[PDB]
Every structure is written in C-alpha cells, then in structure tokens.
Scaffold this motif. Sequence first.
Motif, PDB file in Angstrom:
ATOM      1  N   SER A   1      44.152  48.851  36.933  1.00  0.00           N
ATOM      2  CA  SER A   1      44.647  50.087  36.375  1.00  0.00           C
ATOM      3  C   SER A   1      46.169  50.049  36.205  1.00  0.00           C
ATOM      4  N   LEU A   2      46.823  49.095  36.848  1.00  0.00           N
ATOM      5  CA  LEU A   2      48.283  48.955  36.722  1.00  0.00           C
ATOM      6  C   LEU A   2      48.649  48.299  35.382  1.00  0.00           C
ATOM      7  N   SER A   3      49.832  48.619  34.880  1.00  0.00           N
ATOM      8  CA  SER A   3      50.441  47.904  33.753  1.00  0.00           C
ATOM      9  C   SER A   3      50.608  46.432  34.062  1.00  0.00           C
ATOM     10  N   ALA A   4      50.772  45.625  33.021  1.00  0.00           N
ATOM     11  CA  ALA A   4      50.969  44.197  33.215  1.00  0.00           C
ATOM     12  C   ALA A   4      52.230  43.926  34.028  1.00  0.00           C
TER      13      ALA A   4
ATOM     14  N   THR B   1      51.518  40.180  41.889  1.00  0.00           N
ATOM     15  CA  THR B   1      51.281  38.761  41.956  1.00  0.00           C
ATOM     16  C   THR B   1      52.513  37.994  42.419  1.00  0.00           C
ATOM     17  N   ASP B   2      53.708  38.434  42.015  1.00  0.00           N
ATOM     18  CA  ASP B   2      54.958  37.810  42.502  1.00  0.00           C
ATOM     19  C   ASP B   2      55.130  37.956  44.030  1.00  0.00           C
ATOM     20  N   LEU B   3      54.788  39.137  44.551  1.00  0.00           N
ATOM     21  CA  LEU B   3      54.857  39.444  45.975  1.00  0.00           C
ATOM     22  C   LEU B   3      53.891  38.556  46.731  1.00  0.00           C
ATOM     23  N   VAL B   4      52.663  38.453  46.249  1.00  0.00           N
ATOM     24  CA  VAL B   4      51.702  37.508  46.844  1.00  0.00           C
ATOM     25  C   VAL B   4      52.261  36.078  46.889  1.00  0.00           C
ATOM     26  N   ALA B   5      52.872  35.615  45.788  1.00  0.00           N
ATOM     27  CA  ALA B   5      53.426  34.265  45.706  1.00  0.00           C
ATOM     28  C   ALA B   5      54.587  34.089  46.678  1.00  0.00           C
ATOM     29  N   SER B   6      55.415  35.117  46.792  1.00  0.00           N
ATOM     30  CA  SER B   6      56.547  35.034  47.694  1.00  0.00           C
ATOM     31  C   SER B   6      56.049  35.027  49.146  1.00  0.00           C
TER      32      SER B   6
ATOM     33  N   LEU C   1      52.189  47.981  48.234  1.00  0.00           N
ATOM     34  CA  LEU C   1      52.857  47.834  46.946  1.00  0.00           C
ATOM     35  C   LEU C   1      51.938  48.313  45.841  1.00  0.00           C
ATOM     36  N   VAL C   2      50.688  47.878  45.866  1.00  0.00           N
ATOM     37  CA  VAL C   2      49.696  48.398  44.910  1.00  0.00           C
ATOM     38  C   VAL C   2      49.612  49.932  44.953  1.00  0.00           C
ATOM     39  N   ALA C   3      49.570  50.518  46.159  1.00  0.00           N
ATOM     40  CA  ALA C   3      49.470  51.967  46.325  1.00  0.00           C
ATOM     41  C   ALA C   3      50.719  52.666  45.798  1.00  0.00           C
ATOM     42  N   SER C   4      51.874  52.068  46.050  1.00  0.00           N
ATOM     43  CA  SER C   4      53.110  52.665  45.585  1.00  0.00           C
ATOM     44  C   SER C   4      53.180  52.579  44.055  1.00  0.00           C
ATOM     45  N   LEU C   5      52.701  51.491  43.472  1.00  0.00           N
ATOM     46  CA  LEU C   5      52.684  51.351  41.983  1.00  0.00           C
ATOM     47  C   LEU C   5      51.701  52.269  41.256  1.00  0.00           C
TER      48      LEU C   5
END
Lengths: 162, 162
Positions: free
Chosen positions: A143-146, A153-158, B155-159
């Motif tokens: 449901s989030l924008s790209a 996904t960046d946070l997961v990678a970091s 982060l997902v929840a905040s977005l």
Amino acid sequence: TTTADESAIRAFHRQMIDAWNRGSGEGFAAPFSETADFITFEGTHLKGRKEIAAFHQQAFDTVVKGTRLEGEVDFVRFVNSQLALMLVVIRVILPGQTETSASRDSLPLYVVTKGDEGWQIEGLLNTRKLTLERQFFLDDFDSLSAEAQRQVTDLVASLKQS
Amino acid sequence: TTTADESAIRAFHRQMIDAWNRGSGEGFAAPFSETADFITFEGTHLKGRKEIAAFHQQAFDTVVKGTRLEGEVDFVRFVNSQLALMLVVIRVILPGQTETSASRDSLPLYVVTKGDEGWQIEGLLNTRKLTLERQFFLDDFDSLSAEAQRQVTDLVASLKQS
Ligand SMILES: [Mg+2]
Ligand SMILES: [Mg+2]
C-alpha cells in the motif's frame, strides 16, 4: 483401501525430506509419476519425474545448498481407493542457521493416484504459508508508494550489514 | 474426455470469481463436493461445500468485504477421464484501490474429479505466490534480530500514516 496404501503415501514425505537433506535430486523426484505436475512457490512448473529430478539436483547444488528440510504430515485423506490428498507441513533451516526461517514455511498439497504401477504423486503445489500477521505486513508494504517502499528495503539492507 | 468436460472444469474458476465479486458464499462453494478439502493461505482447513460456503459468506461480509477478484486459467490437465488438475492465477484488488495488491497474488491448484454426479472440486490449495525478489526480502527480514525487525515494522507503520 489398506494400511499399506496409507503407509506408502506417507512415506513419500519422508523420502523427499531425506533426499533433499542429502542433496539427491533423483531421490526427491522418485515418488513422482512420469506425467506429474510440480509447481514451485514462485510459479515454476516442472513436468514429470525426470524434470523434477533435474531441477532439484541443480538447486541442491546451488541456490539451496546447505539448507535442511524438516516436516510432517498435516492430513491424509482417501477420496477413493485410487486417489488420495495429502497436506504436509515443511520448514527450512537456511545454511549456517540453527532455526527455521519463517520466510520458507510451506504447506504443500500432494495429489496421489494408484495406477497400474501403484501409488505415485501426480500433482504437488508447493507454496508459502503466510501467517495473518505477515499477510497484513505485506498488505501494508504494498500500500506504500514506491519511494516509501524503497525507504523500507534500504533500512532492511542497512540492518543486515550491521 | 470431451470438450464438455474441459469447459465444465474451466467454468468453476469463473463461477468462483463472479460469486466472490457479488459476495456470495454459496455461489463460491457451489463447484465443491460435500467432502472437499479447501486449504486457505494461512492454513485454515474447510471441509465440504457447506463449510466452504459458511466461511466465505462470513469473510465476504467482513475481512474481504469490498475486495475484487480477477483471474484466469494457468493450465488444465486431465490425468484420466475422471480426474483433472487445474492451476489458476488469482489477483485481488483491495477496497478503495484500483490496482491489485501483490501481497494477495495467488496460484490455487484445483483437484477435480468426475464422480457419479459429474465434475466437482475435491481439493483446493490456495496459496500466495511469492516473487523471488519478495522471497529474498522475507529471508533478509527473518535473518534480522527481533529488535531490527521492530525498527522495520515501526518504519512501515510510520510510513502508512503519512
Ligand atoms: Mg502504489
Ligand atoms: Mg533471529
């Protein structure tokens, strides 16, 4: 239907678990008929024992090398004396790990027939079993924008650095 | 086997898509036998046409109210004159949306038998189809500590505020 019939169908799940665990594509494919449909979790279609063996040997040598399967019967039901359905719980330990990864939780359905040559797997749909919590997380993600997805996904990678 | 046989099996997928879309649990369950196994994406087991109808009516009235299904045949194969396998692609548009949510992508396997009463669905495993990219994202997520996972879910929840 016999006890023998039921024991044969159940044994298929053990034959496969053990063959995966020793990296044998032919072992893994053995219960399957020459015409069987095998559908993997991402929608790959394998047709027949030989293809199923060839695909899995390659996988055991590469993309799932060092993984371990565990599993058990969820249910077996005879539709008739020549047709059974069997649902199996499968979990996967990724290499280097001691616990199963939820990302790999599977609940395959086996369609087993008793033909001229006795019991064989004719169809197997192997998919990922999601918890409701994981489903809602994915719904939220999609449901989030790209751009928001990319932050995630960046946070997961970091974090996997790290 | 006839053209008629194949047309009947294919029609099941349309009967279901259309019944879902008009919120009819009985419509959705109609192709199923009185003994059929229906396995949902999170591992719920429904036994028989009536249970399948009761479960889906309740769902259409609550947790999937306003969703829309779309779908099409992936393959149909006759094992013999009385047994077929059919794989179907299903996608779901969540209420208020115009596009399908990837989180709901499904590739159900239908096990269809031709009994005394003609063709009926005897088994259906309905699971989520993951892309390889989504699979690796989930693998990565599950490899994180609970604390790192919490940063990600927060982060997902905040977005989604937001
Ligand atoms: Mg969007
Ligand atoms: Mg951990």
